[PDB]
């Protein structure tokens, strides 16, 4: 008795190294990379709705700065905000800048509803050379710069808007800060000025701040922007004796807010992907990625490792 039968397994000339609990370099026949380390050099405009701010960041977009008209009526899953965005209007700050930016981006649309505000005897539609629109002096087109009457008068303002719609309203308003006491009286008249905006369960009061600031677009004055949300069944009251940068209406807020914002200089292309990093879209089925912690959409999970290989075959023992 002399025939032989042998049981065995395959092998290849050169396999792939993987890690186990006990060994950090085990050669197996095949393996699969689980970390995506390669990104597209562009953002995919599908299936997610991307809106390119271009030269306007989202705050200037809400305010209606010059050059931001293309953002009117816009709706987005992801607002694409550009690093090389430019201020093209009156110098301003927003006391809770990131919170306003967050609310606007999350909300996911710029749907402005014009409203008329019977302001007393004050002059309206103040403009500035810092906010040029085709070299004609202009201003934020969502705001209304209120100044004193011709007959040397700024009366107490006392206006009310009632919300009986079926959506919450976002009112953006501001307070102007003059550079000198002469400036304050030359615009306002009153000194000090002051703004008070209130709802049933909330309020806000601002004292203007007079002082010389660095020149920005030929101005020493500043505007500070604020906002007020008005729920259905609520209402809003504007009270001023000066320095109010009034709203021309309100933004519509979605009941459900599901959108966001991504700050990146990456161009929008023609590809298809549901995962965007600040370095570009990902196109992958891998469970992890090492490209950026900044990622939005249906994405692999961000990890520190550059590579993690899953064995998809047995130990490779050639010959």
């Amino acid at each position: 008795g002399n025939p032989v039968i042998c049981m065995g397994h395959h092998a290849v000339a050169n396999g792939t190294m993987v890690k186990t609990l006990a060994d950090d370099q085990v050669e197996v026949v095949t393996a699969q990379e689980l970390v995506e380390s390669q990104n597209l050099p562009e953002l995919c405009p599908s299936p997610l709705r991307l809106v390119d701010g271009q030269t306007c960041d989202i705050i200037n977009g809400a305010l209606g700065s010059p050059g931001c008209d293309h953002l009117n009526g816009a709706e987005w899953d992801v607002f694409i905000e550009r690093p090389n965005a430019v201020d093209t209007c009156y110098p301003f700050d927003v006391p809770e800048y990131q919170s306003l930016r967050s609310i606007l981006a999350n909300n996911g649309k710029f749907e402005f509803i014009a409203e008329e505000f019977q302001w007393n005897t004050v002059k309206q539609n103040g403009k500035s050379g810092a906010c040029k629109r085709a070299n004609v002096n202009d201003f934020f087109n969502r705001l209304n710069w209120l100044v004193k009457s011709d007959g040397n008068a700024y009366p107490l303002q006392n206006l009310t808007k009632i919300n009986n719609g079926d959506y919450a309203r976002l009112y953006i308003w501001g307070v102007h800060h003059p550079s000198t006491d002469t400036e304050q009286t030359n615009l306002y008249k009153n000194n000090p000025g002051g703004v008070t905006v209130s709802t049933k369960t909330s309020q806000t009061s601002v004292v203007p701040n007079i002082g010389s600031r660095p020149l920005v677009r030929g101005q020493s004055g500043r505007v500070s922007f604020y906002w007020t949300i008005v729920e259905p069944g609520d209402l809003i009251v504007f009270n001023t004796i000066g320095n109010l940068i009034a709203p021309r209406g309100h933004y519509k807020l979605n009941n459900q807010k599901k959108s966001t914002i991504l700050n990146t200089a990456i161009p929008i292309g023609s590809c298809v992907s549901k995962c965007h990093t600040d370095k570009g879209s990902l196109s992958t089925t891998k469970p992890f990625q090492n490209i950026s912690r900044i990622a939005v959409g249906d994405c692999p999970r961000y990890v520190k490792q550059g590579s993690l290989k899953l064995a998809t075959g047995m130990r490779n023992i050639p010959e």
């Binding site: 092998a11 249906d298 961000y302 993690l308 290989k309 130990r315 010959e319």
Partner: protein, 172 residues
């Protein structure tokens, strides 16, 4: 691996085995041959494809989160935002590292296991007609032509046909 077949009493793998993961290599009076075993091969592949699919299985579908990059330091709130994200990343990086190490350990044991199951299957078919040579091979103590070999491979080998011949050859 746990069973000590692959990279164990099986000295090495077969580069010539290109249509299967496991198989049979034989020698008898009319020649030699290598043939893949489908059942063992499919068992291993199914288990590995199972792992692959459970990995692809789930969702990290996120939109509005927190800021993660900052120009200048701000203090308390920024510190917390950075610590939250750094904490998350370390925990997910740990999960990824452990998952692949656990899965790979298991994959290697599963493939070692399926090799051993195949060897054990054939051992049991042969009963008293063959002896384990120790290298994953059986010495068969009777004439076994190509049809006999194929009957072993396809699981229809009837040991009683050859038993008298085999017992006589093994002993005495």
């Amino acid at each position: 691996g746990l069973f000590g077949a692959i990279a164990g009493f099986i000295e090495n793998g077969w580069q010539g085995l290109i249509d299967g993961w496991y198989g049979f290599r034989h020698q008898n009076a009319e020649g030699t041959g290598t043939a893949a075993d489908l059942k063992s091969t499919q068992a291993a592949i199914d288990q590995i494809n199972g792992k692959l699919n459970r990995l692809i299985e789930k969702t990290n579908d996120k939109y509005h989160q927190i800021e993660k990059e900052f120009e200048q330091v701000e203090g308390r709130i920024q510190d917390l935002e950075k610590y939250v994200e750094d904490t998350k990343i370390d925990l997910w990086s740990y999960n990824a590292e452990l998952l692949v190490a656990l899965e790979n350990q298991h994959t290697i044991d599963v493939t070692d296991s399926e090799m051993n199951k195949l060897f054990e299957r054939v051992r049991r078919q042969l009963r008293e007609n063959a002896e384990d040579k120790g290298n994953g091979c059986f010495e068969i103590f009777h004439k076994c032509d190509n049809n006999c070999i194929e009957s072993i491979r396809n699981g229809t080998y009837d040991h009683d046909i050859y038993r008298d011949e085999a017992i006589n050859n093994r002993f005495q």
